[PDB]
Design a protein around this ligand. Sequence first.
Ligand SMILES: NS(=O)(=O)c1cc(Cl)cc(Cl)c1
Ligand SMILES: NS(=O)(=O)c1cc(Cl)cc(Cl)c1
Ligand SMILES: NS(=O)(=O)c1cc(Cl)cc(Cl)c1
Ligand SMILES: NS(=O)(=O)c1cc(Cl)cc(Cl)c1
Lengths: 282, 282, 281, 281
Amino acid sequence: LTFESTSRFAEVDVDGPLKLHYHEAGVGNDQTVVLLHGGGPGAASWTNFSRNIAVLARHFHVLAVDQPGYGHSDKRAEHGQFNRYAAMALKGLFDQLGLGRVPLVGNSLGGGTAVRFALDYPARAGRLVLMGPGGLSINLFAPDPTEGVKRLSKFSVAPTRENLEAFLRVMVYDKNLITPELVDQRFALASTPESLTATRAMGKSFAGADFEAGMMWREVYRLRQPVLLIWGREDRVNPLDGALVALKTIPRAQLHVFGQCGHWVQVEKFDEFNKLTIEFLG
Amino acid sequence: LTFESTSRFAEVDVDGPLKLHYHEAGVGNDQTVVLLHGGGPGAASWTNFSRNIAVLARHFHVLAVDQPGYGHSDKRAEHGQFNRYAAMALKGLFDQLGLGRVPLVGNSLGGGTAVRFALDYPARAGRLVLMGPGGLSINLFAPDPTEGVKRLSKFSVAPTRENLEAFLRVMVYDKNLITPELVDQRFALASTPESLTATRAMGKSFAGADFEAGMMWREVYRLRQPVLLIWGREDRVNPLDGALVALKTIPRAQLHVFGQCGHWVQVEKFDEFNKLTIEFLG
Amino acid sequence: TFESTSRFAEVDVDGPLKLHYHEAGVGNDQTVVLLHGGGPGAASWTNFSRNIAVLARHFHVLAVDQPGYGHSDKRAEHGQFNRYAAMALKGLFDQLGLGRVPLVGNSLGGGTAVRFALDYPARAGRLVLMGPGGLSINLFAPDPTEGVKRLSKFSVAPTRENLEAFLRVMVYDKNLITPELVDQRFALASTPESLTATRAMGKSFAGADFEAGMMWREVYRLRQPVLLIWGREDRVNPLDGALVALKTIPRAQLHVFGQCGHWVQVEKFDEFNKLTIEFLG
Amino acid sequence: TFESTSRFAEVDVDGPLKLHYHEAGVGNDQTVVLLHGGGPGAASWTNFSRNIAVLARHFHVLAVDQPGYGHSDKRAEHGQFNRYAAMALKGLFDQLGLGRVPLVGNSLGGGTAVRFALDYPARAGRLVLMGPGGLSINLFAPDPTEGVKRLSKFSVAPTRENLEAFLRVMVYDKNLITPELVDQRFALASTPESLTATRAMGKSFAGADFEAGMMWREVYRLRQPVLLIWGREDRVNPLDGALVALKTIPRAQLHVFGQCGHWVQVEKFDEFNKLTIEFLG
Ligand SMILES: NS(=O)(=O)c1cc(Cl)cc(Cl)c1
Ligand SMILES: NS(=O)(=O)c1cc(Cl)cc(Cl)c1
Ligand SMILES: NS(=O)(=O)c1cc(Cl)cc(Cl)c1
Ligand SMILES: NS(=O)(=O)c1cc(Cl)cc(Cl)c1
């Protein structure tokens, strides 16, 4: 497994052709799992889930999808509420690949996409594993915008190297993870005009009349499947108090909280996260 | 493994000889683990950890100790703050068995004993697994006494079969676990004069000037080992809000919460609890 | 007096519905509507005994018996209760010619106040909500709470002993639960109309319109100032149920009283009256 | 006026310590001590500008510059700060012949108020604590909070731009942060004595007496009524830090203002004044 061997493209229909890039691994395993990455500038499937795709592929058929706006998937200048938009895309990939009811793994932005998908297409979503998820989270104590969200915005307005490192450092508990190479690589991807276009589209979509589609804490009481919520105690993007409504209202919820862990659970607690996910998904 | 094959007795010194009953299993395994049962009338090591001792013994050298006042351990009419009292007893067993630094597993009352032990004898306690633990818990939202605590008290004042079933039913999420046989067996053990004596001793000890020894939420910021907190979402004895100070202040804490689970985690979520414990303890 | 303030009105909620209420302080510039808590034998006058007289020196007070309670109609059928009660209140508003009126609500009535403010937004002003149902969601307390359990137990087995047990976990200071109070509530709760109202309440929970009671989902939409008041020791609607509403209601405030249960306006009556009067004017 | 109310006293805390304070409303029956928040350039008069005059019509007000702030001594060394300040306040109490006095404290000063009430229990009456340090423990917010981070950043790099950034996450309404305010605070914070006080504060955190600042451990011992006041949007000492104290202080109350930050007595000054006056008498 390299970026190239696993790379795949599909074209789906979401008000018109939409190219989705994903990675496929562990082919031949009976049970398929879909991984949905976190947001943040420069984010994509391969780098987000580097500490995991290989391990998970020893147990599952893994499909790690670049959400629209990220990675090598299309970066339209236009789009509605994002989680719903990405969920519609994922629905097209599901139909195309002939996929049935599949468990979903989602980190941060992609966790929100996972939930939106599970709500909109309930027969198609199996068990959920959600790490510092957006969407279903609502920060009952932390004033919004959080520190993490503010630094992301500040990057979006002024896309400098300094603003990106500042953002990345409040993503993780262990700031030694934020190396010069990580910052440089992420900045190179995030700084392209296409990615800047996608950032503009993400910004305008917030003003949309479909905003309620992002407020999934209002809806997850309807989720019938087991759901494993995973949180870094020190998450400064989507803080721990945001887990509470979901834990309370999802009937078959579990919550796991890691001390000394930020927003990036699958990297910062990669060994522990992998065993939980593998056990939880069978 | 039967009650008889695993049964062991030791005499330790806590202001005088104190007979401790415990169960020993999986002899020959390199790493020793001590299990400390929950409170409640009729409670003891074998019945509390019935769904677990066998499984854990496939990986560890298991020592499940009847705390003083419970099981076949001594039921003195007199004793000071309980967790400290039971911890002193456990210290004597540790010294006698030549035990070094050992991980501890504790449910409810015994979780408090585990913590008190880890605080008082810090070099002797390894990783902790704590299920709906007393002591370190402090119910920030739930008015005290909780429902669970009130029904236990009501049994203590009026030790009837009806009061014991009522108590047992708020111990678990799935009330079908509370069968006629369970109630009868527990009532038979709890109703003996010796056990009634131990209940009186437990009651008087609350009035003691050493009460601060029970307030372990004040002290667990000192715990240096990894600690796995495990909670039933629907725990009505030690409710979930009681986990928060410990999660915040123990540097290497983790928390796992099971939906559809009460105070009796190791029974109600026995398969999941066993894999977490085994993985966490190595 | 009970009699001097007593009023009746008949409105349309899927047919005639007779509503009883108490009116006081007429002539005052600002009208305020009071909505009592639930529980057996509850009604406007006895729920708000420590408050109507004080409030009427500042406001035009309308204390309304919600359907199923007091001297208001006790239908044997009805859908989600807070919406049902809100529809009734809406009828009363149009009839009395009210504009935008602040609402005061304890427990059940707090839920009705909120449902009303959501369903008829132009008609509700500032809200004072004491241990309110509806907008509360117990993030930590397992449901049903001990309060709700004892209330249910009475519904199944309506004995004096079971009512007393409910009334006793309603309050921090159990000395407020006098034998006379128990006897007064029990005589009222034990009538066949009242048991019909109780049975009707329980069935409504099974309704397809249940989402209407999940008001924590919707209060981010409230634009008016809202003052939440809670007893730290509330065992019916515990304190953790305040949190979503505090977070999501933009002009929210919260006051918490230590040594206070579910019945705020009684157990902390002087402080409640002063808080309410200032917040409302 | 600043000058008319200004007073100095010298007490013993391991040697002479000069304390500055403001005195008003002399002759009133009940004395009240005010303890300002922290942050660079903070002092009694400017912290409590919207409050001293109003409070002095009801109480005998003593607003004390805590050591390290205002015109009080700024030693380059000192142990855990709230105990240090409390020892100073204790000196002032004996000298002025005070008995049992209610305390009002914002942020840092709230922590000092609490430390004082614990260390000299006979000398403290009712407490009013606004976004207080010391007794707070942020159960959900990762530490250091964004507020504390920007405060630290100023300590390392004391620029106008960094002070403004701190002042701006101190408050909900950023229009309160006027250029003039920034300039006033910065001129005071930038003096070499003040930087010495700032450097001293940071080192004290490394002290062996750190447990003295962990007052959430001890307030279950407070016997007096305590009124906690918080801004919902406090980014220095966030709202989740109120919870242990609310739970464990037996006669506690809590008030939370939506649309309010760390600087409660300014951002919600009319409501704060009224709450304080009623609670204290
Ligand atoms: N709060 S959230 O999970 O939805 C989220 C997280 C990140 Cl890092 C980025 C975006 Cl655009 C959104
Ligand atoms: N709150 S606690 O864990 O300490 C506890 C639980 C039970 Cl079931 C019994 C006793 Cl005596 C004490
Ligand atoms: N949870 S609630 O406020 O809606 C409530 C309280 C009482 Cl005391 C009774 C009823 Cl039926 C409902
Ligand atoms: N967390 S705290 O209240 O103690 C506090 C607040 C401020 Cl603004 C400054 C200082 Cl040094 C300390």
